[PDB]
Amino acid sequence: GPHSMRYFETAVSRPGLEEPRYISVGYVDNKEFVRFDSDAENPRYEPRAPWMEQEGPEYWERETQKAKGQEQWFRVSLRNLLGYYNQSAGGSHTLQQMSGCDLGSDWRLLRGYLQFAYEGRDYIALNEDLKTWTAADMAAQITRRKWEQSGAAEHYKAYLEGECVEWLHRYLKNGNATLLRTDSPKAHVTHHPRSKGEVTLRCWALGFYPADITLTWQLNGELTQDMELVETRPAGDGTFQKWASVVVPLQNYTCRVYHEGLPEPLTLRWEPP
Amino acid sequence: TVKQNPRYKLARVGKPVNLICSQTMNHDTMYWYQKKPNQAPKLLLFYYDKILNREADTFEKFQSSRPNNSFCSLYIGSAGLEYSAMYLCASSAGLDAEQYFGPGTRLLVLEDLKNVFPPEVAVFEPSEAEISHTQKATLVCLATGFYPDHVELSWWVNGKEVHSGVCTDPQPLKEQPALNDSRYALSSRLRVSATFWQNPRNHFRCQVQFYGLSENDEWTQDRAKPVTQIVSAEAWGRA
């Protein structure tokens, strides 16, 4: 089973303001469970998942104290990067972080993640080996040189292999009835006529969880770039939507639906009634 | 309020140095500054709780360690001639709050410790003509043949350290200025009442704290090891 814990951090500088906005978003199996925001009346790690209510005040206070330190780490790092790129003191700047791990089979650790970003583009990232760094530019090479002498990678590896794995095991046990929940998609084909004697057959897929789905059109065998596709969109009730369409002459064509919620892949055609 | 021991640190080229700083104010932020002679104190690095920050032009030369929030240390490895400067340690409650500085640790790095020598402390009894002309008595202290400039002079009267009527030179004189690696000489003055010097039970001591070699410091010379020692000279009153 593919299981993963992620922490999506953001630090946005404000014009003239001494303190920037720090947001830390936690994810378990691509779905949100925890969130911290500096803009709030009382900045604390708030539960976003219903199964997360099981934790006592000891867990919430410890995570909030971790976030307060991170809030200042991002504040200094953001100011140090202004010195590297030799940019103006007043402006809008963004520092992003992606950290966590993938379990694999079965509850053992498969891949470690630790990436950083500046102005939307890549900056510095910890490699697959979890010992070396990849610098996107010369400013990131200074950060790399700083982290190589201090041995930062050694302690980041200790989290991803230790604490990150240990805590994800607990979240899978506490939240199991709603986390391992699978929703099968609702599939149907629509008819849309066009000029020049052509028609667009749109293969729909509505109400499915998780977001991972595969929609392909077939002319008996395999239709690649000629097929129109849209990004997987959320409905709003914790479920997803997606469709795939193809331009065909004025016709019986096959659509293939691949989802983990359904036992056998769905094969469907158009009517008419 | 912000402790920094020792006041003077001595080390050989190529050998590692670790300067310790502590605070009882329970502050989150602790800073480290470099003060070169007659130059502006430049910020080297700082520690906010657990987080460490080093300046882009400072790093590769300086390392930092923090055993607990109450302490902070600056690590040098290996030491060179360019590292010879005054090292100040600051402390602040927050990252954007007022900074409280320590006394500072004056660092001097030498090629060889062969010329390092402890001081010879001598007390000079007040002049009979001084007690006759004026109603005061001046005691002159003399610390001689010491290397380096690492000394702390203090006057002790009846077991207590006295600051009133005490004057020590801001900089000691070079015994042989014509040559380098010359030993220094520092003098001090203690002016007490004529009646105070006339009392035979009154004790006067000139304590000089020397900062030289330590336990980790290597010594291969036949002469006695010039360790961080206290050299004193005492004198009693007469009528």
Binding site: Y7, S24, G26, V34, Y45, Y59, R62, E63, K66, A67, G69, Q70, W73, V76, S77, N80, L81, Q97, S99, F116, Y123, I124, T143, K146, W147, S150, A152, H155, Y156, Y159, E163, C164, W167 | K50, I51, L52, N53, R54
Partner: peptide
Amino acid sequence: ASNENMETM
């Protein structure tokens, strides 16, 4: 649980 970063950039 979240992670606390080491040395700054």
